[PDB]
Every structure is written in structure tokens, then in C-alpha cells.
């Protein structure tokens, strides 16, 4: 899928990228003349008619008047869409400092590893691992340490054409980390739900308890519906 | 430009600002009567005609029906634009806590210094420095310390009408810091790309290597194009 099980800490070559820092002829004649390539449109508000069957000029005016208002809205909408994106660009740049890989994976619509070298972002590709081999461990306790226990679950996996089985630690977005150095002080009554593939593995007291499908846990409805109402298809009736 | 070389830690007076916490007559007669200031519009769906050349009522209906659907869209679009901005307001407020100056410089479309006093933001103005005098230093290693080296490059500059040359540390958005206390433990094979004005100064092993123009490094395409298609200008032909 978009985010397969992968190791994103082996890539040796990253592509360097940078966030961008920097992101009609009407003459009165109340008649107004608008120049078109093959014609000139004369619009009269009092006339309620546009000049390139008396309705022809009215029908032209109807389309032309709606054309102007809609194209003016599309300009105001565009102007604000840009001022919005210029902000979301600053937000993404700030977010990359907090976490680069997740933000860059979003901007690429594909799992990519990202590291920040000075003011540029080095984007590299991850090493995909066999989905079938990936398997989480029931114990989340660090061996030989009761006080310390892995914050995230350990995963046993293998590379595409490699027989050897590696042991790593599951991260976010199905990203396995070869270094199992993610750990936390053991907490009483600690329950954690970790997503691995299409399953959420529930761990109680740093011990696996149950594996539920993603639908088991409700989804936050962040999406803001625009409720776009498409223009209906009206069949005008002939009258007299 | 929008962000000239500047010192934003000298301002003694900041303006206090706060994020906002809190951000038609149709009567059936299937005829529906809509009251206008100079007239009353009667819309018939079955009739396919609107009453304020049989086309006059149809042409009125065409504009009126599109007027209703488009204005209902512009209302649904607006409602969602607001719910979106109410969220982006919370995001900006959270971002200001992480970094106030960058977020407030974005909200002002101009370089401004910002400090968070309790739940209000003190916005002040920066001290511009001569662009010509600004010059980065090749060495990025703390003197007398091999283990410690400046995380960001040091800059030699001077104030608008001040002959004296100051020594500071380049920050983000062409902001020079008089205090050169930004430093990090020296790392092997460390390569950093730092933006100063319209140039990206590459530093290898805490030593300046090359100065490339901004176009040298690719720009991340965060902008989400709306592909706004403006209404085309159709010249209706007269038929019979």
C-alpha cells in the first residue's frame, strides 16, 4: 500500500530539497466594452443585455454576467487559497523540524525517509521488508531490566531476498527500526494500542493481550466536508 | 525584501496581541416567491420560469436558478472555510508556543519579533542590518574547543549608520543573533546547507565548502494547485 513495512535508516543517498521561501480591459462607452480575441463584448447593466431573437443579447448577458461574478469569485477564492498554502508551507516547515519523515512522506504521498541538513531536507528511500515475515513480539519488557521496558513493540522481520531474520522495533506508519533503543520506565496499569499493518495490537502491562482489526477502534472525523452541491440538470420547458 | 538581515533581540517595546478564542424569505404560492428590494421573484420548477419574448422568464429563471445553487455552494464553501480557519488558528497558536517569531512573521507577512508573555504575544520590530556588510565565516568550530562547534554559521555585520562591525550567528529567515551561543557537539562527516540571503552556503566538517544559488537546491512543491478553471467566453450564435 502507501506505507509498507520498511527500514528507513539504511539509505545512504538522500536528494536535497528546500521549502520555497517566496510562494482585464474594460472601457465605458453605462455600456462597458470587453475585448475578446474574435469579438468585443459590450455589457449594459440598465440594458440587461450584452452585445458580441431579442433574447440572444440577454442570453449572452446572462452567461457574461454570471461569467464575470463567478470568475471574480474564483479569483477571490484563489487569492485566499494561496495565502492559506503560504501558511501551511510554514506549518509543514515547522512540523519537519519536529518530525521530518512523517511530513515529507505526506508531501510526497509515498513513504520516504527525510533528514534535515542545515536548512535543506535530504529525502531518501526506505528498504522494504517482507510483509509476511513481519511479526510483533508479545513481551514489551527490556530483558534483564524490570524498571525499563520497550516503549514500542519489537518486530521480527526479513529483507525481500534475504533468508536471515532481523529483530527491530515497530515505529509509526509501519516503519521497523533496526535499533531497538526505544524504551520507557515500566508503568503500572499501562495499556497501549499499536498499529501494525491492518491490525491494532493491544498490549496490557507490556504484554500482548489482543489483536483487533482497524475498524475495532473508531476513526476521528477530522475531514471538514465542503458539501459541494453540483449544479442540477434543469430541462427548460418551451412556453409561449 | 520580506525578510532582510536583521537583529530581533534588541526591541524593548512589543505590542501585546491575543489569538481569538471565539471566531432568505421564500413563500410557496410549486411557485415560490423571493422578495427583492425593487421586485418579487416567483420561481416555478415545473414552469422552468422565474417571474420578476417568452424567453425573458426562462432567462430570468436560468440566472436565478444558477444564482441560488451557486450562492448555496458559496455558503457551504464559506461555512467549511471558517471551520478550517478555526482549526488553523489553533494550529498557529500551538506553533507559536513551539516557535513564536516564525509564526507571527507569517501572520504579519513581514519580519517581526514575537515573545509569549503568559497567554498574550508581545510583537516587536527587528533592527535591520546593512545587507552588504553581512558576511558568513568559513570556520563553524568553537575556538579553543574541538568537541564543541557552532551549530549555525557565524556572521560579521554592521548596523545601518554604525561603522562598528558586530559578530553574530546566522539564524533562520536571515535573522542574525548577537549572542553566538548556538553550538553543537562536533560530528564526523557532517554536511550542512545554510541559507543566507539568496545563497545556500554548504559547510563540510564545520568548514565552508561552496556557495550555491537558491535554484541549485530543488524546491519542495507543498502548494496544492486548485486548478481553478475560469468560465470560458462563449459567443452565442443567433438561430431561427
Amino acid at each position, epitope marked *: 500500500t502507501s506505507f509498507p513495512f520498511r527500514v528507513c*535508516e*539504511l*539509505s*545512504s*543517498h538522500g536528494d536535497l530539497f528546500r521549502f520555497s521561501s517566496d510562494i482585464e480591459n474594460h472601457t465605458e462607452g453605462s455600456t462597458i466594452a470587453t475585448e475578446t480575441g474574435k469579438s468585443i463584448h459590450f455589457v449594459t447593466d440598465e440594458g440587461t443585455s450584452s452585445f458580441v431573437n431579442p433574447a440572444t443579447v440577454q442570453i449572452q448577458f446572462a452567461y457574461d454576467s454570471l461569467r464575470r461574478q463567478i470568475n471574480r469569485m474564483l479569483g477571490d477564492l484563489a487569492r485566499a487559497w494561496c495565502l492559506e498554502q503560504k501558511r501551511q508551507n510554514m506549518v509543514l516547515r515547522e512540523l519537519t523540524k519536529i518530525n521530518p519523515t512523517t511530513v515529507m512522506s505526506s508531501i510526497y504521498g509515498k513513504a520516504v525517509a527525510a533528514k534535515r541538513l542545515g536548512d535543506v531536507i535530504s529525502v531518501s*528511500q526506505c*528498504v*522494504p521488508v517482507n510483509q509476511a515475515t513481519v511479526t510483533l513480539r508479545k513481551s514489551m519488557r527490556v*530483558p*534483564g*531490566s524490570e524498571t525499563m521496558c520497550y516503549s514500542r513493540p519489537l518486530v521480527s522481520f526479513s*529483507f*525481500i*531476498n*534475504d*533468508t*536471515k531474520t*532481523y*529483530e527491530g522495533q515497530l515505529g509509526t506508519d509501519n516503519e521497523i527500526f*533496526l*535499533t*531497538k*533503543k526505544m524504551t520507557e520506565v515500566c508503568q503500572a496499569t499501562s495499556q497501549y494500542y499499536f498499529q501494525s499493518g491492518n491490525e491494532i495490537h493491544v498490549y496490557n502491562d507490556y504484554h500482548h493481550f489482543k489483536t483487533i482489526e482497524l475498524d475495532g477502534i473508531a476513526t476521528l472525523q477530522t475531514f471538514i466536508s465542503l458539501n459541494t452541491s453540483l449544479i442540477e440538470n434543469i430541462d427548460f420547458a418551451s412556453l409561449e | 525584501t520580506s525578510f532582510p538581515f536583521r537583529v530581533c533581540e534588541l526591541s524593548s517595546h512589543g505590542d501585546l496581541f491575543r489569538f481569538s478564542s471565539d471566531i432568505e424569505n421564500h413563500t410557496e404560492g410549486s411557485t415560490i416567491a423571493t422578495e427583492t428590494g425593487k421586485s418579487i421573484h416567483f420561481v416555478t420548477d415545473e414552469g422552468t420560469s422565474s417571474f420578476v419574448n417568452p424567453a425573458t422568464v426562462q432567462i430570468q429563471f436560468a440566472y436565478d436558478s444558477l444564482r441560488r445553487q451557486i450562492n448555496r455552494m458559496l455558503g457551504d464553501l464559506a461555512r467549511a472555510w471558517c471551520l478550517e480557519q478555526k482549526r488553523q488558528n489553533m494550529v498557529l497558536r500551538e506553533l507559536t508556543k513551539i516557535n513564536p517569531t516564525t509564526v507571527m512573521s507569517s501572520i504579519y507577512g513581514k519580519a517581526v519579533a514575537a515573545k509569549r508573555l503568559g497567554d498574550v504575544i508581545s510583537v516587536s520590530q527587528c533592527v535591520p542590518v546593512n545587507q552588504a556588510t553581512v558576511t558568513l565565516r568559513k570556520s563553524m568550530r568553537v575556538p579553543g574547543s*574541538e*568537541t564543541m562547534c557552532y551549530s549555525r554559521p557565524l556572521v560579521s555585520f554592521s548596523f545601518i549608520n554604525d561603522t562598528k562591525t558586530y559578530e553574530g550567528q546566522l539564524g533562520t529567515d536571515n535573522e542574525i543573533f548577537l549572542t553566538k551561543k548556538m553550538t553543537e*557537539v*562536533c*560530528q*564526523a*562527516t*557532517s554536511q550542512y546547507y545554510f541559507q543566507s540571503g539568496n545563497e545556500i552556503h554548504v559547510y563540510n566538517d564545520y568548514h565552508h565548502f561552496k556557495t550555491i544559488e537558491l535554484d541549485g537546491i530543488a524546491t519542495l512543491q507543498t502548494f496544492i494547485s486548485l486548478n481553478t478553471s475560469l468560465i470560458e467566453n462563449i459567443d452565442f450564435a443567433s438561430l431561427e
Partner: antibody
Amino acid sequence: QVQLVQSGAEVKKPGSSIKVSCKTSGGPFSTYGINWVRQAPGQGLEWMGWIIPVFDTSSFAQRFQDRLSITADASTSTAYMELRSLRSEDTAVYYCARDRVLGAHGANPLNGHHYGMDVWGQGTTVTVSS
Amino acid sequence: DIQITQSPSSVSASVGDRVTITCRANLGISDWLAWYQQKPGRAPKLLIYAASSLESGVPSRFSGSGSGIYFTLTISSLQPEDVATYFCQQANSFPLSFGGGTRVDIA
């Protein structure tokens, strides 16, 4: 289990050239990288060099940057290291160690040498004497 | 060339006592140091592949820690099979180097 079988002990007269071999069995020889480490008698381990068979990329230590040639034969799944102009100080047990993490995914080089060497070989005692 | 130095040349402890081995570097290895254990006439055996990640098949008593300049290997309880030479290896960038082995011995 990936097993690396090295060549046998060979006493070499000074100024001769020795080429110790290391056969990989039980894993992808080309993808992973083999490091050549030398431990002189009563001395600490000393990295001699490393090569990746798929990209035939061989990095050597400055001391042997001129007299050391590490090669790899995919057909025999064997990596061979040759030391020329042998001197008494060259007497040591040469070790072939395979990197723990994959070093190459297709045509893309990986930093698998950052996780150390897991599989080592028996070791070839090379004595330089006349 | 990054230069690594093991703080203790040799360590003598009683069975059950903890043993700490330090490996410092002139530059930053960024969690790419590996700890190895070598017994007389035997090939070195990797214990901690990462700065702190213990390799499989290694007794939990062996533990690693440290980042960049400082690094550390701790043996919770010294046991008769812990008597060997421990070498720290920089894996950040070629040329890779091994720190002088620390001789752990029964006291």
C-alpha cells in the same frame, strides 16, 4: 546459519604476497559486505578493509591503502584479500567478518556497516618468516 | 579518521560485581558504536550491535549505552564466562576502527 569458511594457515617468506579466501555459505554473499580484520599476536583487532561484492566497492585502511587488494568472486561466493610486500609485522590471524545488516537493496547502496559485524570466520594465521 | 579510545585498559572484578567499559571518540559516532567480546584463540563475538541495542544470543547481563562522543558497556553481573577482551568499534564512517580491548578478569 550464515557460515564464513576462511583459508588455512600459510607461512609466507618476507616480500611475498598472500591471498586469504573466505567462502560464504547460508546467505546472500553479494548483497552483504565482508570486512577483513587483522589481529597481530598480543595486539588489539585492526580493521584492514571492507568490500561489497554487488558494487565491488572496496574501502581499505591507510596503512595498507597501497599494498592491500580485497576482491570478491560471486561465482564461488568467496571474498579474497591479498597483502603484498609482506613484512614481519604482517604476522597475524586475518579474520573475514560479514556485516550484520544488508549493505545493498538492488542497485541502491545501504549503510549496513553502521550495525557492526555479526558472522566471523575461523581466522587464517599468516606467519611472515624466512 | 575518527579516533576511539577505551577508558579502561583492564578491569578486575569479583563474580557478581558490575563492570563498565567506556569508549570515547574525537567526533560524533551518532549511536554507531559496536561492542565485541573475544576469548583467547576465538573469533570476536558481537554483543551490542548498536550503541545500546543488545544482539540476540547474548546474555541480558551485557548492556550498552552512550551517544556521539561518550559510549559505555556494562556487565550487570561478572560471571566466569565474562572473562575476555572487549573491543568497541566505530561504525559511523570508514575507515572503521576498533578500540583497544579491555581485559575483564576474575578478581
